[PDB]
Amino acid sequence: PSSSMADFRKFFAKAKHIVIISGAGVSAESGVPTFRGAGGYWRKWQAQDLATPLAFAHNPSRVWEFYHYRREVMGSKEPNAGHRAIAECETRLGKQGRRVVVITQNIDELHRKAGTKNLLEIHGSLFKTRCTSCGVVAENYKSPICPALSGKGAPEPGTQDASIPVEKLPRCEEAGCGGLLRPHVVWFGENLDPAILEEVDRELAHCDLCLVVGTSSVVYPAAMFAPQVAARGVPVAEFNTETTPATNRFRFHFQGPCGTTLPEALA
Ligand SMILES: C#CCNC(=O)[C@@H](NC(=O)[C@H](CCCCNC(=S)CCCC(=O)O)NC(=O)c1ccc(C2(C(F)(F)F)N=N2)cc1)c1ccc(O)cc1
Ligand SMILES: [Zn+2]
């Protein structure tokens, strides 16, 4: 694929509807642990070990400790220059009648924190809960999310399970429910919400330029979104620290941290 910033910016100057797909690399550049690839371990595990319905069924306390840790670390994390360039682009183009929408794989809300408004969080959020009894989805920023998790979630190998009884894990506050909450995060083996897929597809089907930023293009179905756009004939530019299995489907590839390349690309 082309690495001509000038040719990319010619498309950018005329694009009326830009889709920006983002993944864990953008979060890693803010120091967010992503628990995938080089993104870290929590105790002896990575995300694919704990972000599953079976893990939560068998050890909901351990899975809650993991997500508790990740919630609490966010207080010290800020959007990076990549997030900011993306948010600034949306704002600037929006005044010109031009649409920018972010479709993110990330669950850390840093695009929101940066001021992105047109945002599809296709895997949910660290800061939402879903009740396993009544299905209600709620925003939750409480620190700690429940008292039993105070001081828990420590990430060092050999840390013992808190083994919090399910009654003392986060519980639904809807009147008359009281069910056990789970993170409102899409886990491996679970499909994405059909309403979110419909919203994704509406943007993919109408965009005239697509950027795929900081993603390894190995998590499906998200990894197929930018290839679908390219197959429609629309230019796709990949901004990533390395090539990926999807790179050769795209019109452009710009190697480097997104905080380095995106401020120039989206100026
Ligand atoms: C990493 C990696 C690669 N794994 C994958 O891509 C797998 N994908 C998956 O498993 C994804 C979900 C991925 C969620 C990722 N969540 C993240 S990144 C949020 C943060 C998690 C955290 O950090 O805590 N799900 C699916 O791909 C999926 C698709 C269809 C169904 C379905 C059908 F009927 F529609 F076909 N049966 N109902 C179910 C699941 C996968 C595995 C095998 C397959 O054949 C297809 C997909
Ligand atoms: Zn409930």
Side-chain angles (χ1 to χ4, degrees):
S2 172
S3 59
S4 176
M5 179 65 80
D7 285 348
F8 169 79
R9 280 192 51 87
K10 286 174 173 176
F11 288 121
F12 179 61
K14 300 197 166 157
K16 302 177 172 26
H17 187 164
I18 303 176
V19 164
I20 302 176
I21 295 153
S22 69
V26 186
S27 299
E29 290 179 40
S30 293
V32 177
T34 60
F35 306 102
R36 279 209 280 114
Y41 280 65
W42 181 85
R43 301 186 187 165
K44 58 196 252 198
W45 299 288
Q46 288 199 296
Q48 275 219 72
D49 298 306
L50 293 160
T52 72
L54 193 172
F56 186 76
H58 284 181
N59 203 328
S61 183
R62 181 186 296 165
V63 174
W64 262 121
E65 282 201 86
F66 176 56
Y67 283 101
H68 172 68
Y69 172 77
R70 295 170 70 176
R71 287 164 56 88
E72 297 301 318
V73 159
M74 290 308 302
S76 66
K77 307 299 175 177
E78 294 286 314
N80 63 59
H83 296 108
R84 291 200 302 274
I86 288 168
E88 291 163 12
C89 175
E90 177 186 354
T91 296
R92 186 179 69 254
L93 266 59
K95 294 179 190 161
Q96 302 163 2
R98 303 160 66 197
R99 175 164 184 84
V100 179
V101 59
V102 174
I103 301 178
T104 191
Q105 302 170 7
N106 302 322
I107 63 167
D108 49 66
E109 293 193 2
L110 285 179
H111 287 293
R112 295 194 63 187
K113 194 169 190 178
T116 291
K117 286 239 149 228
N118 300 327
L119 179 64
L120 295 177
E121 288 173 308
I122 68 176
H123 297 143
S125 174
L126 288 174
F127 299 111
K128 290 180 171 66
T129 61
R130 184 162 77 262
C131 180
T132 64
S133 291
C134 74
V136 171
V137 177
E139 296 188 354
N140 189 311
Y141 295 91
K142 297 286 175 67
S143 176
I145 186 167
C146 65
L149 281 163
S150 181
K152 303 303 187 179
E156 288 76 22
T159 300
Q160 301 304 112
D161 284 334
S163 299
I164 300 161
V166 290
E167 292 86 2
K168 295 198 255 217
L169 288 174
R171 308 302 296 206
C172 187
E173 298 176 80
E174 297 296 295
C177 181
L180 175 65
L181 303 180
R182 58 170 278 176
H184 185 64
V185 173
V186 181
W187 286 333
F188 292 94
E190 300 182 330
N191 198 8
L192 280 61
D193 180 336
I196 275 135
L197 292 175
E198 179 169 320
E199 289 167 347
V200 165
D201 285 345
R202 178 174 160 135
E203 305 297 330
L204 301 182
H206 289 92
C207 73
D208 58 1
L209 179 62
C210 173
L211 288 69
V212 55
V213 305
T215 175
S216 283
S217 287
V218 301
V219 175
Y220 287 77
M224 280 310 299
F225 295 165
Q228 285 164 359
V229 174
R232 196 154 64 71
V234 171
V236 177
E238 179 183 56
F239 293 79
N240 197 47
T241 48
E242 51 187 57
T243 60
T244 75
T247 294
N248 287 342
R249 320 266 222 114
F250 303 144
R251 197 79 56 85
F252 301 92
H253 173 89
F254 297 103
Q255 187 106 323
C258 289
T260 299
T261 54
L262 287 181
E264 172 174 6
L266 299 180

